[PDB]
């Protein structure tokens, strides 16, 4: 998996059958983290 813009994504070309098909796929597996909830401030719903 290459790291296009820091996100590690596989390519994994699928299995061919008929000499001109070339099925590809692409995908990654993410997660987000918010250590230290002290710094965070929100204003909930202002107008629009």
């Amino acid at each position: 998996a290459f790291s296009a813009n820091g996100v590690y994504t596989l390519m994994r070309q699928l299995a061919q059958t008929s000499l001109y098909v070339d099925n590809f796929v692409v995908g990654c597996i993410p997660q987000l983290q918010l250590t230290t909830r002290k710094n965070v401030g929100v204003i909930k719903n202002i107008k629009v």
């Binding site: 909830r37 002290k38 710094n39 401030g41 204003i43 909930k44 719903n45 202002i46």
Partner: protein, 49 residues
């Protein structure tokens, strides 16, 4: 968001300013960006250093 819940341990909460007044008019109350929301939010950030 983790094992820690904001009910048991209140040191795991954000500073929030809810701009939805409980009794103003009826039908989308929605207080609209008073300039002192941002320094009533800044007071809460100053406590948790």
């Amino acid at each position: 968001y983790a094992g820690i819940s904001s009910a048991t341990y209140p040191l795991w909460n954000v500073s929030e300013v809810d701009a939805w007044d409980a009794n103003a008019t009826g039908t989308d109350k929605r207080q609209a960006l008073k300039t002192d929301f941002m320094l009533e939010l800044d007071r809460k950030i100053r406590y948790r250093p």
